[PDB]
Amino acid sequence: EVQLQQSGPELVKPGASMKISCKTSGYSFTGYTMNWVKQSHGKNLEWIGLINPYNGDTSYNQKFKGKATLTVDKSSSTAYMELLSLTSEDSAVYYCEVINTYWGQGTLVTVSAAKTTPPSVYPLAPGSAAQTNSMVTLGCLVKGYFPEPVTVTWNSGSLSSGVHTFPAVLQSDLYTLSSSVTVPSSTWPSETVTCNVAHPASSTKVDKKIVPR
Amino acid sequence: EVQLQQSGPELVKPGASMKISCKTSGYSFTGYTMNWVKQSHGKNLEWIGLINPYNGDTSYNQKFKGKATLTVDKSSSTAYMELLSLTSEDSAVYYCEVINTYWGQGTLVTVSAAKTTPPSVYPLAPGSAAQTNSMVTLGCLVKGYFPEPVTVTWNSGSLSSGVHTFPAVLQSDLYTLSSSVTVPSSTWPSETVTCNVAHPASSTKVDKKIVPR
Amino acid sequence: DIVMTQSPASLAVSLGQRATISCKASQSIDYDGDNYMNWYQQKPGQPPKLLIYTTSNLESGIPARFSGSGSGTDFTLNIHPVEEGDAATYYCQQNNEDPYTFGGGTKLEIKRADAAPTVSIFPPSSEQLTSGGASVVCFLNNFYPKDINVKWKIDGSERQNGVLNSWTDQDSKDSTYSMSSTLTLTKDEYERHNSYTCEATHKTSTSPIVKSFNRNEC
Amino acid sequence: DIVMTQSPASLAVSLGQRATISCKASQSIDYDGDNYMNWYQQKPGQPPKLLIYTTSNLESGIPARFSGSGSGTDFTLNIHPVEEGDAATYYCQQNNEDPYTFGGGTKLEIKRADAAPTVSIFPPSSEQLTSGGASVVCFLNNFYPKDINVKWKIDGSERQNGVLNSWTDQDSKDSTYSMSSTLTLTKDEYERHNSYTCEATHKTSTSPIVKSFNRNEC
Amino acid sequence: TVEELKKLLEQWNLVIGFLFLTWICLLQFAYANRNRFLYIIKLIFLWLLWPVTLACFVLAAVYRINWITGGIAIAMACLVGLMWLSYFIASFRLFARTRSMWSFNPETNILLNVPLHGTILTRPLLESELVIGAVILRGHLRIAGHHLGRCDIKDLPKEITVATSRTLSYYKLGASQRVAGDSGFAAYSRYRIGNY
Amino acid sequence: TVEELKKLLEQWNLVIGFLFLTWICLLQFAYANRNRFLYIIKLIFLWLLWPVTLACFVLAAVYRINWITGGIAIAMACLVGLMWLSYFIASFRLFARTRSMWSFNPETNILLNVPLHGTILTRPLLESELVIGAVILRGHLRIAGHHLGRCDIKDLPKEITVATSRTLSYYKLGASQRVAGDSGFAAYSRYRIGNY
C-alpha cells in the first residue's frame, strides 16, 4: 500500500527558489532510496538524484549538481526537494519514486514572469442544428487561462464514456483547452449537462450549464 | 515429463507369486523413493513400502513385512515388485509413485482359481421402436467374461460424447458389463455405429456392428 | 496404530458453496513442530492426484480453490468455489509415523437441479437369443438424484429376483447419473411370456415412467 | 556520457502482432557480468510504470506479454500478444553508470481498421460573443489514421492563419483519434462575413466531408 | 638442561604458529572460495586440531604440580577426551545408519543427499530445517552453501536430508523462480519424515 | 635457569590450550545457535587471534639462531603483519564509505543493510552475489545466515548491500512464496548499482 503525494502544481518566476514535497504513506519512511526524475520539453526522461532518509548520503549528477538539493524530514515522512535558480528550461514535471515501481503523482513547475489569469468558460451546443440523429455532440471551451493545468469534467464525473479533453495550446502567453462529449438524442436535453472547469492555480471552480440557443 | 508404466492387468491363482513392473521415463531413475500403494475392496488406501534405487534401503510395514518384497534394476530403470503367497484379499490395484505427485497407471491383480472366459458381445438396437425422436439410444452388452478389466469403445473412439459404460457386476463367477450411447435420429442409421470390446487377459478384440432387426 | 478417521460420511453441495473435509489425527500427530498432512484427490478410474502436501500451501499446477488448515488432531480441507469439474474422492495421508496410512475416504457429490430420467428399453438380441439365453435391458440416462428404484413386469406381475442394477459415477459434464437394469432369463422361460415391461419411480415427478414391449411385436 | 539511442522511430502494429523495441547501450554497458536494463511504460497523463527491472524476468503484477532479451550493447523488449489496452510510451534505463539516463522514447500505436470522422460544428457562444470576440470550433471524433487536414472557409475562400488544431492521444477503448480545430476572430470581423464552413479531407473516403452554418441562420 | 628443553619448547611454539598461519591463510581469502578440495582439508585440519588441544592439555599436567592448581589441566583434558569420544560414537551411529562415508566430519552429524544429474552427492549440513534454499548464479548450483557444480533452472524435484538418531526427511522442489540469465532461486520444503 | 623458562613456557602452552578450548566449545555446539551476542565474541576472538599468531611468530625468532633456519620465523611474521596492516586499511576504507560501525570484522569487508521494521540493521556478509535468499521458519527471519528476529511474510521489499571500493548495490524482493504456517522463502535480486 505504498502511496506518494506531491505538492500539486506550482508556478514560479525566473530567479526564485521553490520546494517540492513527497509525502509518503503505507510503509516505514526510512529504507527506500527515494530517487527523483524530471521530465519536460515533451517526453524526455532524466535522473535528478537520490537521498538516503536514514542519514544523508546524497548522490546527484553533474548536470543537476548545485541546481537542486534534497532534504529529508524523518518525522513527517516527507521529502523536501529544493530548487534554486530556476529558468525557463526548468518548467518540468518532477516525480519522486522509491524503488523504481511506486511512482509519485508528479509536480508541474512553470517558470515564467507571467500573470495568473482566470479561465473563460463557454458552453457550445448545436443551436439550430436541423439534424438530430441519436448521436449529438456538445462541448465546453476554456479560453485564456494561466498557468497549467486545468481539469474539465462533465456533471461532476458522472459521465465517463464518450468524453474527449483536447490538449491545451499556447497563444499570446495564454493556454486554451476544449472538452467534447457525444451523447444520443435520448439524453439531450432531457438530462442536465454541465461542464465543470477547475483551475487550482487561480483557485477557481466554475460550473456552466449548457443550454440550446 | 515423468511417466510411469506398469505391467498391465494380471490374473493369478491362490498360492503363487508374481512380479509387477514400474518402468520409468523422463528422469534419472536413481533419486526418487519410489513408494508403493495398494487399493482394494472398494476405495481403501494403504501403504506398502519404499525402496531406494541407489543402494537397497527397503522400508516396509509390519502388515506387508514378508508378504511382498521390492527389487530394483538400475539398468532398465524399472521396479520389480514381487508378491508372494497371494490370497483372495490380495486382489488389488497396485500403484507405484515416486514423489507423491507422479502416480502410475495401476496394476489390477485378481487372485482366484477360476477360468479365463472369452466375452459374449451382443449389440442392442430399438427394433420396431415406433418412436423415433431425435434422441435414440443403442447399446452393446458384454456378458460372461473373466477376468477384469475390459475396454468398450464406439467406432474406435471417434464418438466420445453421450457415452455411458456401466460398471461390471459379478454373477456365477462371471462379470457382466454394458455400454450405451444416445445419438440423434439424424445419425442412426446413416452413419456406421460399431462397438469394440477388448479384453487383454483373453487377448481378444471383437468388433460388432449394430443393425436394426 | 495411528489410524485416522475423517468423518464426512457423504458431502453434497451445489455450485459455489463451500466443501469442507475434516480429517482427524489419532493421538498426537504433530511431529517436528508441524503437521505433514497430505490431501489426495482420486477420480474413478484414475490414480489419486495430490493437492496439498504439508497441511497448506498447495502444490503448483492445482487451482487455488483448495486450501488446507488445522493443527494438532484436527485438520480441514476447504474448497470454496466448487466448480463443475470436480466430483472425485478425497483422502488424507499422514506421512509422519511408521505406517503411511490414508484416511477413510469422503465422496464428493455435486448438487444440481433435478432432471427426468431418459428411459430406453432393449429386448434381447437375436444372436444372444439363439445362444441359449436372453437378457432384457433398461437404460436410464441423465437423472438426479442417484436414489431410484426400477422394476420389471412380466405378463402382469412384477419380478425382483434375476434383476441386476449398475450405477455409473457422477458425470463431470452434467452432474447427472445413469443406471442400467438387466433382467436375464433362460430360453426355456423367455417364450413362455409375452409382455416385458420396465418401470421407474423417480423423485422428479409423481408419474412412474413405463416402457414395455412384446415378444410377438418384434 | 553513456547516452543510449533506441532506434524505433515510430511503431504501429495491429492486434496479436509482435512489438519489438531495440534500446542500444553506448560503449560497454555490461557491468558486473550482466545488464541491469530497466523498461518503463508511461501512459499519457500518468507516471511511468515499470515492467522489467533486469533485462528479463519481469516484475509481478505485469502480464507475461512483456519479455526482455539481449546483452552487450543490444537489448530488445518484445510484446507478442499486443492487446487492446496498451498504447503507451516505452523507455529504457541503464541503472548502471554514474547517471541513470533514460532512453529516447518510442511511441507505440495500435493499428486498427480505418473509420470515418464524426464531424460536428459549433458556432461561437453568445456569452463569448458579447465578451468581444468569437471562436468557431470543429470536432472530429473516432477517426483513423491520425494524419488529417481540416480547413475553414469564410464567405467563399479558405483561411489558414488563425486556425489552431489539437490532437488527442490514441484512446484505450477504440484505438481511434479525435481532433479539435478552432478558428478565433475578433468581433470586428465576425459580423463582416456570414458563412462559416469546416471541411475535412480524410483517407477514409474520397469525399471531403463538409459542415457549414450561417450567422443569420441562428 | 636448558638447551634440550629450549629446543623442544620453541619447536612446539613454532609448529603451533605454523598451524595458526595455516588457519589464517585458509580463512582470510579462502573461506568459501569454491570449496571442492578445500572443504576436505578444512575437515581434516579440525580433526587433527582435536588431538592438538588434547596434547596441550595432557602436556600441561606433566611438567608441574598436579594437586594444588595443575590438576585442573588433566581434569580439563579428560572432558575433552569424552567429548572427542562422544564425537566418534555419534559419527559411528551415523555410519551405522548410512553408507555415505561423508561422516566423521567435525562440523556436524547430518547428511544431505542431492541426486544431481548422474549419481547422488552427499554433503555435510549444519542443522535440519523445514526450508532449504538454492541458487544458480551463472550455472553454479549452491544448496545451503555447498557448491555442487554446473546446473540450470530445470533442477531435481527432490533431495534427502538424513540425521543420525531417528530422522530421514525428504524435500520437494517448489516455486522455482528464475533470475536474469540463468540464475535461479529454487526451494526445498520438507514433506515426508521416515523414522528408524 | 630451567625454572623460570619452565613456568613461562607451560604458562604459554596452557593459555594456548585454553584458547583452543574456547574455540572448540564455540564451534562444536554453538556454531550458529542464534548468534545474537555470540557473533560479536566470534569476531573479537578472531581479532585477538591475529596478534596471537603474530606473537608466536615474533617469539619463534628471538630464542634461536636467526640466520640459518630461524630467520624464516621473522620473515614469516612480517608478511602476516602486512596482511594485518592491509586488513586495517581495507576496513578503514569501508569505515570511510559508510558509518555503520559494523566494520573491523575479520571475516570480510562487506555490509548488508536491512531496513527491518524500526531502524536499519547492518550485518557482515561474505561475498556480493546477484541472488540473496531469506527464510522465516516460525517467525525468525534469517537473511544469508544472519538471524534478524521476528518477521512474517509481509517482508521489506528492498535492502542494500554495500562493498568498500566502488560498489553499493540494491536488492528488491520478488516472488515471495509462503510455506506452511508462517515460514517463507523470500528472494532478493540485484537491480541497481551505485558507484563511488
Numbering used by the authors:
A (entry chain D), B (entry chain F): 1 to 213
C (entry chain E), D (entry chain C): 1 to 218
E (entry chain B), F (entry chain A): 9 to 204
Mind quoting what the paper says about this structure?
We chose two Fab fragments (YN7756_1, Fab-E; YN7717_9, Fab-B) among the six Fab fragments tested, and successfully determined the structures of the M/Fab-E and M/Fab-B complexes at 2.7- and 2.8-Å resolution, respectively. Surprisingly, M protein dimers in the M/Fab-E and M/Fab-B complexes differed in their conformations, with sizes of 86-Å height × 50-Å width (long form) or 72-Å height × 57-Å width (short form), respectively. Considering that antibodies used in the cryo-EM analysis were raised against M protein, it is reasonable to assume that the M protein is in a conformational equilibrium between the two states and that each state was captured by its conformation-specific antibody. Specifically, the binding sites for Fab-E contain residues mapped to the β2-β3 loop, β3–β4, β5, β6, and β7–β8, while the binding sites for Fab-B contain residues mapped to the hinge region, β1, β2, the β2–β3 loop, β6–β8, and the C-terminal loop. When transitioning from the long form to the short form, the two bundles rotate toward each other on the extravirion side and against each other on the intravirion side. Consequently, the linker between TM1 and TM2 is widely twisted outward from the dimerization axis, and the interface between the two bundles is rearranged so that the two bundles are closer on the extravirion side and more separated on the intravirion side. Synchronized with the motion of the two bundles, the dimerization interface at BDs is also largely rearranged so that the BD “umbrella” opens at an angle from ~100° to ~140°. In the short form, the hinge region is inserted more deeply into the cavity formed at the top of the bundle. The upper cavity of the short form is larger in volume than that of the long form. During the review process of this work, a preprint paper reported the structure of M protein dimer reconstituted in lipid nanodisc that corresponds to the short form in our study, which is highly complementary to our study and further strengthens our conclusion that both forms are important.
